Structures are given as C-alpha cells and as structure tokens.
Structure 1
Amino acid sequence: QVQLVESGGGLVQAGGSLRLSCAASGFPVKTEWMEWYRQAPGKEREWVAAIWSYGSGTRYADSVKGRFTISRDNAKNTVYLQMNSLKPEDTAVYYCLVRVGSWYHGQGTQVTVSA
C-alpha cells in the first residue's frame, strides 16, 4: 500500500520558519503529481502549491505567491516545504496528495501561527 505519514505541526510565531513533510512510500517524488492543501477552521480545501514529475517547475496560488517556498527531496521520498513570514490567517491543517485528485492522501498536520 501507500503511506503518507506527515509531521511538522506545532506553535511558531509569525515571521518564523518551520518545515512540513509527509513520508511517502511506494513511489518517488520525480514521477507523478503532488500538491498541498489547507483548510482553516470554517474554511474549505484551499490549494496551496503544486509539483509535477521531474521537477517541471514551481507554482503557487493568489495568496500564496511570493510568500511560500516548496522544495522536494528525492533521497527520503519526501517533500520539504518551508514557510517564512507566516500569515496569521494561515491557521490550517496541511494535506499532501499523490496526484491531482487521488486515492491516497495524508492523515493531517495542524500548525498554529498565533500572532
């Protein structure tokens, strides 16, 4: 099967930096689709960033462009995503998929930005 256990949840002040990652299995990070999704309390599944096969490029969303950094890692079959200058409206549980719409997705990691 495919497992996507993720870690990185915690409390960090606005303007800090902490990295998020989900431990994938059964596939490498240079072959298929992979995204990141948010859902704030009361908010919907907001798409954050996208990575395609073989590092085709980098792309974010309207409120995410120029603020977020996404980095892959072929060695440990993980995506190492960093965020700096944390928006205080970004309190959400971070999700990662294995395709653009897929049968396998991460369990969940919840972070707090506070002030």
Structure 2
Amino acid sequence: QVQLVESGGGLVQAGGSLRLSCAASGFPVKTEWMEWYRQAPGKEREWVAAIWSYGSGTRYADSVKGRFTISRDNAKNTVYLQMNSLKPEDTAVYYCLVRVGSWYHGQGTQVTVSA
C-alpha cells in the first residue's frame, strides 16, 4: 500500500519556524500531485499549499501567500513544509494528501501557535 506518516507536531511561539514532513512511499515526490491541508479546531479543512508532479509549479493560499514555504524532497520521497512568522490563527492539525483528490490521506499532525 501507501504510507503517509507525517511528523513535526509541537508547540512553538509565534514568529518561529517549524519544518513539517510526510513520509510517503510507493510513488515519487515529482510524479504525482502533493498538497498539505490544515484543519483548525472548529474550522473547515482548507487547502494551504501544493506541489505538482515534476516541479510543474507551486501554489499557496490567499491567507498563506508569502507566509509559508512548501518544499519537496525526492531522495527520501518526502515533502518538507516550513513556515515563518506563524500567525496566532495558524494553529491547526496539518495533513497531507496523495494527489488533488486521492484515496490516500495522511494520519494528521497537530501544531500549536500559542502566543
């Protein structure tokens, strides 16, 4: 099958940087659509950023444009996601999919912004 274990959950004060990565298998990091979505407590799971196949392009969110960075790594078949100047409302449970619509969904990683 395909595994999508993600790690990087922790509590960091606002303005810090946290690197989040998902351990993928069964496919390359540049052969399929790759996106990471966030689900805040009481909010809806909204798309944040994505990485296409073969580095076709990079997209972000309207509230996240110029706020976070989405990167991939084909060596370990993982995508490293890091953000700078975390907003107080950025605290959410992050997750990763397998495509723009795919049968594989990540387990989920929760991060805390606090103050």
Task: Quickly name the TM-score band, shorter chain normalised.
Answer: over 0.9
SS in 1 for 2:90: coil
Displacement, 1:50? 1.1
d(CA) in 2 for partners of 1:87, 1:56 = 29
- Segments of structure 1 that go 5 or more residues without pairing to the other structure are none
C-alpha distance in 2, partners of 1:55/1:85? 26
Count of residues paired in the alignment: 115
Shift of 1:27: 0.5
Output aligned runs, 1:23-102, within 5 Å.
Answer: 23-102=23-102
| 4+ residue runs over 2 A deviation | none
Q: 2:51–2:71: 8 Å Cα contact kept in structure 1?
A: no
Distance in 1 between residues matched to 2:76 and 2:27, nearest whole Å? 11
Which structure 2 residue ranges, 5 or more long, are not aligned? Answer: none
Q: Percent identity?
A: 100
Note the C-alpha offset of 1:84. Answer: 0.5
Deviations 1:67-104 (A, max 9, x none): 11011101100000100100110111101011111100
Relative to the length of structure 2, the TM-score reads 0.98
> Which whole-Å CA distance do the structure 2 matches of 1:68 and 1:18 have between them?
10
What RMSD, in angstroms, separates the aligned Cα atoms of the two structures?
Answer: 0.6
* Structure 2 CA distance for aligned equivalents of residues 99 and 18 of structure 1: 23
TM-score, structure 1 normalization: 0.98
Pairwise CA distance, 1:57: 1.4
Instruction: Confirm or deny: 8 A CA contact 2:35 2:50 kept in the other structure.
Output: yes
Task: Measure how far apart 1:18 and its partner are.
Answer: 1.1
Cα distance between partner residues in 1 of 2:54 and 2:102: 19
2: CA distance, partners of 1:87 / 1:38? 14
